[PDB]
Every structure is written in structure tokens, then in C-alpha cells.
Structure 1
């Protein structure tokens, strides 16, 4: 396909993360310049892979990570090629922000803009009937301009009650993972459901218990993230409704 990149245009560097592993890289480009890339390994069957990557490579949105292509080193081991992001994942960034060494205290207006950015990304993927299935702040990347894009597309405390039960997954389960992500950002990196263990989570949710309003968090913001966890998927808003709720709340500060 036009998605496959020659292994010779790619030089692999140091390991950055674990998701097999994700590496630093140089991509040699059509214009003779080299581009900083992240290279992530993957766990025939590769035809369905290449075909999915070919599909994702057509994505174009500031708040979705570009898939620049795929390499196959040879047993074939394929590798997803992505623009390198020195600011790393959101979750780590939030934790670092609570240290004096790390980034400055993040004001709420900036925390809401992270949420708007993810909403915009998920709005765009949702429209093309693409399901993420692993939305969480650890899988949102920060670009050099500090804009957030959604990533690592294709964790029980992010799985929506209907997906825990029936092994069903719709865009509305993605909306559930989005509210948990909104909570991770409002809490600046707390694990969801403190004092509840992974095995207790289905029964905790089944008895109607939800993520608790964070201490900083605005009531209006907590109403938006609470709407993402309504029992019936059909009663949850769409990403397009959510994006505009958040855009409108951000406008009023």
C-alpha cells in the first residue's frame, strides 16, 4: 500500500515507553530531510493490520495523532510510525505538574482546554464510526504547542458498565472512558475510584456508585463528566454534544 514505509528510511533509538515498546526514531522523508518519530512495535494477520493502518493514515485532525505509516522488519514484526512528542503522555504531565521541578501548576482553564482538545479528537473519530476502546489520559499525547491529541488506538476502571457485563462496545462506551479521563485531568492524575479494587468495580458500578466530584472541580464540570456514566449508554451525550458543553464552559471564565 502507500502506508508501508521502507525499513531503510528509519533509524531506531532509545525506548521511550511501554505500549510491546515505543522508541525514539529518525524518518528519512521524500524531501531529503529527517523527521523525529516515535516507533511503536505491535503484538496474513498483517494484511488486516496494514489495512487498518491504511485506514487510520487518512485521519486528519489537530486533536488526533497522525499515523505517518508502518515498517515491517523481518518472522515479520510491524512498527507504527508517529510524530515524536517531547512533552509525552498527558497523565505523566499532570503528575509532573504537582512537583516544583516539573511544569507550573496547571490552571483550571488549561485543564478544560485539554478536555476540549480530546472531545474534538473523539468527535472527529466518532463521526467516521471509529471506536477508540482505550481512552485514558495515559493515551493522550501533548504536541509541542501544548494541544492534546488522542493516540494508542488499536484497564477495568475505564471500562463502561455495559462493556464489563456483555462484552459490548459502542462510541457511548468511549464517552464513558472520556468522563473518567475528564476526572483523571480534574484530579491531576489520581487513579479512578480510590479505596476500590479492580475486582470490586463491576459490583460498585452495578449498585449505582460513580467517580466522586473532585475538590477543585466546578459543579457544571462535574455534571458534564457525570453524564458520561449514566447507566443506559443511550442516555449519555455524544462527543459532539460534550465538545460544545466543554467549549461553552471554557468560554465563561
Structure 2
């Protein structure tokens, strides 16, 4: 079919050093003759059937067609029976490490409230886009949000139980509203500038902790208005959580009320 319209000739790609193990730096030769710096995620698939490859190549097909500043564009796929996902290389890396760096004197200056909110808005904008294409993220976390060269935030990858919604921990279900829950935790990650969610609480204790009605606490710096937006992402009934479309406007309106 046209699921070779996402496959790229292996010859056009050279792999460099491992960035995490695997993710590698790379050079892609583009249709216009120039060379682009790429990141290259390699996936070990269950090759006992075709199920994994079908799911992969399908999702990849429409991930490639995602055009939006706050969503990472998939450039294509290579097969060395070993598939490789080819994404733009982001010199500024993930948001989580950026926030940690900001708390060092040598790293980025003290990020003000305004900038933290814009990051949250950027991520809402990307998730609002993905919701419109009826496309589940399933791994929203600060570490999976990338910084474009203009310092705008795009979403990427589309037991991490501390980002998984109560209904998804128990029932084994995942909807747009679970992504909203994950966006809540991400917002908290940003306001705390990179704290692990739920200090005091071990991973295996998270279901009971949530079940007894407890949620992430308001960070020290955090505006009440911001914390009420964050909290709204963790309401027990998925149907009570706002849409990304609502969250994005609430955050834009908050950001616009703060001075320049």
C-alpha cells in the first residue's frame, strides 16, 4: 500500500553515537539534497507474528502526517527485520532535564512563572491537536516533551505508574481523559521544575493512595488558579476532567493575566 510512503531508503541514513539505550544521533539525506540531523529510536518488536509491525507501521503512517508546531514530526521509518523511527534532532533536548538544568547557576537562568505557563500552554496546544486526530499519546511526561530551537515545546513518543490515571491503573482502560490526567502530572513536573511526582509515596502504593482520594500537592510557587487547573486533570470520573481544548484556553487566559 502507501505504508512505504513512510519507509525511507536505509542508504540515506548514517547512525552516530547512542544518546540512550536505543536512541542515536544521525544524518538523513533529504529529497532536496541537503543533510538533516535526526534522532533515531530503534524498537525490538515481537516478530513471532505481524501484529506488532502492522500496529507500528499504521501508527507511523499518520504520525508522519502530523503538522503542528507543538507536535514532533515523524520524518519516516528505516528497516535495517529491525525498524528505526527517524525524528528531528532537538539540540535543547527534553523539558525535564532543561528544568533540572535551570536550577543550576551554569544552566538556563531562573525560568519565571510566565515561561513555565507557556511550556504548559505549548503542551496543551500539541495535545489539543492530537485529540482532534483522535490520537492517544499514552506516555505524556516532561521527559517526553522536546524543546525546538526557538524554545517552544513539542510533545513526543506520540512502570510509569505516577503518570497513569486511576481508571487506567485498575480497569486497564486508556482514553483521551487519561492523557489529560498525564498532562496534570506534567504541569506539576513543570511548576516543581522537575520533582518526581508524589514524594513520600512508593510506586506500588500509588493505586491505594489515589483510591483514598489523595492527589499531588500544590507546589510552593504555584498560583491557586494554576493549581485548580492541574487538580481538574485528576478528578476520579474521567468525564469530569476538562478536554485539552478547555485546558489550553484556561492556561492561555491565565498566562495573559500575568505581566510581560
In the superposition, the TM-score normalised over structure 1's length comes to 0.96
Kindly provide the CA deviation profile for residues 84-127 of structure 1, in whole angstroms up to 9, marking residues without a partner as x.
10000000100011001111111110000000000000000011
Q: Tell me the CA shift for residue 16 of structure 1.
A: 1.6
Q: Is the 8 A contact 1:137 1:185 kept in 2?
A: yes
Q: Is the 8 A contact 1:27 1:35 kept in 2?
A: yes
The answer to whether 1:163 aligns with 2:168 is yes
Distance in 1 of aligned mates of 2:207 and 2:162: 9
Kindly provide the CA deviation profile for residues 205-225 of structure 1, in whole angstroms up to 9, marking residues without a partner as x.
000000000000000000000
Q: Which runs of 5+ in 2 are unaligned?
A: 45-50
- Per mean C-alpha deviation after superposition, the further-off stretch among 160-169 and 146-155 is 146-155
Q: Tell me the CA shift for residue 30 of structure 1.
A: 1.1
Kindly provide the CA deviation profile for residues 170-216 of structure 1, in whole angstroms up to 9, marking residues without a partner as x.
00000000000000000000000000000110000000000000000
Q: How does 1:113-124 map to 2 (within 5 A)?
A: 113-124=118-129
Distance in 1 of aligned mates of 2:215 and 2:197: 10
Q: Is the 8 A contact 1:123 1:240 kept in 2?
A: yes
Q: Is the 8 A contact 1:40 1:81 kept in 2?
A: yes
Kindly provide the CA deviation profile for residues 18-57 of structure 1, in whole angstroms up to 9, marking residues without a partner as x.
4xx1110000011111001001111364233222211111
Q: 1:124 to 1:94 in 2, by over 3 A?
A: same
Distance in 1 of aligned mates of 2:159 and 2:87: 14
Q: Is the 8 A contact 2:96 2:142 kept in 1?
A: yes
Q: Which runs of 5+ in 1 are unaligned?
A: none
What is the SS of the residue equivalent to 1:14? strand
Q: Is the 8 A contact 2:23 2:40 kept in 1?
A: yes
**Count of equivalent residues:** 249
Distance in 1 of aligned mates of 2:137 and 2:154: 13
Q: Tell me the CA shift for residue 15 of structure 1.
A: 1.3
Distance in 1 of aligned mates of 2:233 and 2:33: 47
